[PDB]
Enzyme design. Sequence first.
Site, PDB file in Angstrom:
ATOM      1  CB  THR A 154      -0.886  -0.099   1.200  1.00 30.98           C
ATOM      2  OG1 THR A 154      -2.059   0.979   0.843  1.00 30.98           O
ATOM      3  CG2 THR A 154      -0.044   0.177   2.716  1.00 30.98           C
ATOM      4  CB  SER A 203      -4.083  -0.977   2.685  1.00 31.40           C
ATOM      5  OG  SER A 203      -4.773   0.016   3.241  1.00 31.40           O
ATOM      6  CB  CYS A 204      -4.111   2.179  -1.192  1.00 31.07           C
ATOM      7  SG  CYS A 204      -4.755   3.333  -0.188  1.00 31.07           S
ATOM      8  CG  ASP A 252      -8.717  -3.371   8.702  1.00 36.76           C
ATOM      9  OD1 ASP A 252      -8.181  -2.106   9.126  1.00 36.76           O
ATOM     10  OD2 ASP A 252      -8.547  -3.615   7.538  1.00 36.76           O
ATOM     11  CG  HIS A 303      -5.039  -2.552   7.796  1.00 38.31           C
ATOM     12  ND1 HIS A 303      -6.054  -2.611   6.714  1.00 38.31           N
ATOM     13  CD2 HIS A 303      -4.040  -1.864   7.201  1.00 38.31           C
ATOM     14  CE1 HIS A 303      -5.870  -1.890   5.675  1.00 38.31           C
ATOM     15  NE2 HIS A 303      -4.697  -1.452   5.863  1.00 38.31           N
ATOM     16  CE  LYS A 304       0.235  -2.391   6.810  1.00 40.06           C
ATOM     17  NZ  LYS A 304       0.122  -1.921   5.452  1.00 40.06           N
TER      18      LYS A 304
END
EC number: 4.1.2.47
Lengths: 256, 256
Positions: free
Chosen positions: A10, A79-80, A206, A234-235
Amino acid sequence: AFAHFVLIHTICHGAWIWHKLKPLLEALGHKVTALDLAASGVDPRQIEEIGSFDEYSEPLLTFLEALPPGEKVILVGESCGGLNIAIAADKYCEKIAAAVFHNSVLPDTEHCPSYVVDKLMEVFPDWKDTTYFTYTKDGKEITGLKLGFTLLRENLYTLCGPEEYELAKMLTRKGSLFQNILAKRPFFTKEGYGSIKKIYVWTDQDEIFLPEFQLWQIENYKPDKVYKVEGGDHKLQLTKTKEIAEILQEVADTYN
Amino acid sequence: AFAHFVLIHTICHGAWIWHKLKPLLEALGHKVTALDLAASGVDPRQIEEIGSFDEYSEPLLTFLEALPPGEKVILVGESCGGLNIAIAADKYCEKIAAAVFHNSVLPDTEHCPSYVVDKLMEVFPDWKDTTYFTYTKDGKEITGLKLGFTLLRENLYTLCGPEEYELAKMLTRKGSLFQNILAKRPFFTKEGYGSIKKIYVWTDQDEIFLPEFQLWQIENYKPDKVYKVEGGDHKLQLTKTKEIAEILQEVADTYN
C-alpha cells in the site's frame, strides 16, 4: 498447484511489508515477487516526482510487461494496492490469472476511480497524527501524506509485535493517494479490470478499513469469492500470515 | 541508568537492522536513535553520489551536531560501522560517552584508516556471489558492491529466521567500503577517537568477521572492555537481541 504471486504493498509502504508472507509462500512451492512501487521502499524516486496513481504503479506495469507470453500471475494487493491492481489489469489482463484483495480497496467499473477512496474517507475521516503536504506535478496540486506513528500503532499495526511496528516507523515514507487525480481519471474498463477474477480477503477486526467500509465494498462490486479471516488486524500478512498463505494456496488451486 | 543510544548500521544496510533491538532498549527506559547513513535504508541518495566514508557518515555527523551542549550519547556500530564511529569521534568526541563495537571493525590511531579493512579482506577474501562495480566521484574510482544473497544467507544471517533474511534480501542496497579512499585519508586522531571509551562485543560464531580477525583486532588496539556473546551469528542484534540489550544496559551503567 504452484503459482507466481505478485505482492503489492500500500501507499507509504514497500515490499518489506511482505517479509513474513513471501518465505511462507515459497515454502509451499510458489514463485513470489514483492515489488517496491514508485517512490516506495528502496525505490530511488521521491513522491514529489510522481503525478498520478498510474505513474506510482510503474514498477508493477514494467514487471508485467517483462513476463514472457503465456505466463500468468496472481496479483495480491493490500490496503490501497487494489488501485494498482485495477490499473495493471487494464493494461495486462491476459497476464492475470486472478487478483486477491487483502483488506484492500476494491475499485469498480461503474463509478469513477476515486469512488471507493471517497467512501473510505467518509467512513474513516480522522487519520490521527498523520501529516499532510502539497506538491505540484504536471500542473496539478497533489496532497501528500506521512502516516502518523499513533495511527500506525493503533489502527494499522494494532496487534503486530513491537519489532514489526518498529519496521513501520523506520521504513514508511511520504506518499499520496492521488485522490483528485483518480477523480479525473478515465474509468476502469469492463473488458480489462472487469473481466479478472477477484478474491476479497478481510478481517472484521480491521481498525482502519472498518467493517462498514469493507462490507460496503463487497455489496458495491460483488467479488468472485470472499474469505473472512478471524481475528488479526489490518496487516493480516503480519498477524495472520499462515492463514493468508492457506487462502492463497486455495486461490492457486482454483484460478489459473 | 538510562542512556541515549545511537545505533549505526553497516554498509549496504540501514536502520532496519536494529528493528528488534531498538524496542528492547526502549523497554529498559533508554532513548534510541537508529539512523540511515547516506545512500542507505530510505535515505534518498544513491551510492554513486558518495565519495568517501566521511561523506557516507553525514547523517551521523549531522545528528551529533544537533545535540544540545552537555548531551552525551553511546554510539553502537555493527560490522563496518566502527569506521563511522571513528569519523564521528574525531569531530564530536565531547558528545560521546562511549562507543560499542558489535562484530565491528575497530580502527586504530597508529595505522592508516584502511588498516583493519585490508586485514579483513585477507582473512575473508571470498565474498561468494557478491557483485562489484565501479563509479567515479571527486576524481577517484570507487568500488561499489551489492552483497550476494548466498553470502547474506550463509555468512551474515546464518542463524537468523527466514523472515529476517527476507528483509535483508528486500532492503540491502548497493554500497561501498571506500577502501582506497580510506587508504589515503588522514589517520584517526589520538585526541578525538583515541580518547573515547571502546567496548568490543563479538561472537566466535561469526561466519564473516571470523575469530582470527576479531581476536587480531582486540590485540591490535586494546578495548576498554570486551564482551563475548556465546552462540548467535554476525547479526547478534537479530539472533541475540536480549543479550545485546543486557550488555548495553551495563555499558550505560558504567560510562557516562
